[PDB]
Amino acid sequence: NATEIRASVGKMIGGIGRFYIQMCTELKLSDYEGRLIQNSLTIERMVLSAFDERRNKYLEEHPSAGKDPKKTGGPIYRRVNGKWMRELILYDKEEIRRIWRQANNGDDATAGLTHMMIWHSNLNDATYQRTRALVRTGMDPRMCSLMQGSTLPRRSGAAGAAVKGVGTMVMELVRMIKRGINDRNFWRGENGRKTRIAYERMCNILKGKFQTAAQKAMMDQVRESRNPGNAEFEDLTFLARSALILRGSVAHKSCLPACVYGPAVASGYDFEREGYSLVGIDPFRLLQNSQVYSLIRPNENPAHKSQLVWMACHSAAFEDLRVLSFIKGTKVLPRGKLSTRGVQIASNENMETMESSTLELRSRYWAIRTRDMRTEIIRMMESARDVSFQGRGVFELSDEKAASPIVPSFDMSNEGSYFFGDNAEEYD
Ligand SMILES: NC(=O)c1cc(-c2ccc(CN3CCOCC3)cc2)c(C(F)(F)F)[nH]c1=O
């Protein structure tokens, strides 16, 4: 059945590629402009915005975009006489939807919208810090390493649920508990009945992420509370801290930008026939046969901007840096050592100083990713407790059948956390 599962994922990637090729053709973008990641993000947000209809399911937007709910837009960058120009494009949401369905042979293809949303989340995880929002909710700033998918939309649903991390679930459940404390009727009536289902859904989602019997049992007690007060917060926090040692089951999906699938489809690659799997060589091979460009700000180091995108492409912001340095072949520095700022350009930035760089997104090897008395038990379980790769090893790109595993070497002395010494901008 894994052949039938590979065909369905391949169909979805091909439609994203076909949708991008169409959008580039409407906008009259060049090969360079089409391969600019800033343009890709604009094009990807436009389709999410057109299909969202302000539901906060695939995206969240500024009230300025709410001026005309029937139109969606964003910034487009074109290269005019060596310089870079920024223009705002406004398309009809109906026409964007029409183009998406046409690219997906009449199908709604919600699987492709989610993939771009998950790539967008992975990019924010690789770019912005969340330590101020942790302090705001009353959580430990050290919980940074468990904030997978913390930027995902308000009503992301089942698709966003799989990639959200332990600390992300704890942050939204604690934002929920704190709303009850300051509002008397938060758990009352029809609003409180809807709120109650949302609470138990979030609790069962977080419960499923725990791989021990005691952590899952502790979640049942937080979920059984009809009026969660400070007692439910102390238990959520004490469980969040335990995840920083006793690991959880968090899914990481390598979702590449549409300007990667675009050119791959444009050159005749049949994703539906050939198949596609986010696990293994498929995203690694596609990145070796790709050419992505990015706008670079003055005084920014292009190698560091390339690293931001390579980690976002690979869902690697929360992985051990000693593992990534072995796979990429180059040293993967903590965010605190990168002379770079996020790929998205701000509405007030000077375009005259803006230059561009070729992103270096290839890697040396490829690899497979595989993903009270109760408080006394989990506390004792942490005392059992070094770089860990679980797996046969790494492989070269020529070995596509994984028949020749390479055993990895890491300096356990060298940094393992991307968030150590973090000086990245705070998300907002
Ligand atoms: N799609 C993929 O197979 C893919 C996988 C991996 C990846 C991440 C981590 C590990 C090490 N351990 C972690 C625990 O689980 C067992 C494997 C191996 C491979 C990466 C990246 F992070 F290295 F960048 N990127 C990708 O694209």
Curated annotation (Swiss-Prot):
Q: Name one Pfam family in it.
A: Flu_NP
Per the record, the domain of life is Viruses
PTM comment: the record says: Late in virus-infected cells, may be cleaved from a 56-kDa protein to a 53-kDa protein by a cellular caspase. This cleavage might be a marker for the onset of apoptosis in infected cells or have a specific function in virus host interaction.
Phenotype when changing residue 179 to A: 60% loss of Homomultimerization affinity. No effect on RNA-binding activity
A GO cellular-component term linked to this record: host cell
- Outcome of residue 310 to A? Complete loss of RNA-binding activity
Does Nucleotide-binding show up as a keyword for this record?
Answer: no
| Annotated phenotype, changing residue 366 to A | No effect on RNA-binding activity
Indicate where this protein is primarily found.
virion
Please name the GO terms that the record assigns under molecular function.
identical protein binding; RNA binding; structural molecule activity
Q: What is the effect of changing residue 119 to A?
A: Partial loss of RNA-binding activity
Q: Where is this motif: Bipartite nuclear localization signal?
A: 178-196
One GO process term, biological-process aspect:
viral penetration into host nucleus
- Summarize subunit and interaction data from the UniProt record for this chain: Homomultimerizes to form the nucleocapsid. May bind host exportin-1/XPO1. Binds to viral genomic RNA. Protein-RNA contacts are mediated by a combination of electrostatic interactions between positively charged residues and the phosphate backbone and planar interactions between aromatic side chains and bases.
Q: What does this protein do?
A: Encapsidates the negative strand viral RNA, protecting it from nucleases. The encapsidated genomic RNA is termed the ribonucleoprotein (RNP) and serves as template for transcription and replication. The RNP needs to be localized in the host nucleus to start an infectious cycle, but is too large to diffuse through the nuclear pore complex. NP comprises at least 2 nuclear localization signals that are responsible for the active RNP import into the nucleus through cellular importin alpha/beta pathway.
Name of this protein = Nucleoprotein
**Species the sequence originates in:** Influenza A virus (strain A/Puerto Rico/8/1934 H1N1)
| Gene name per UniProt | NP
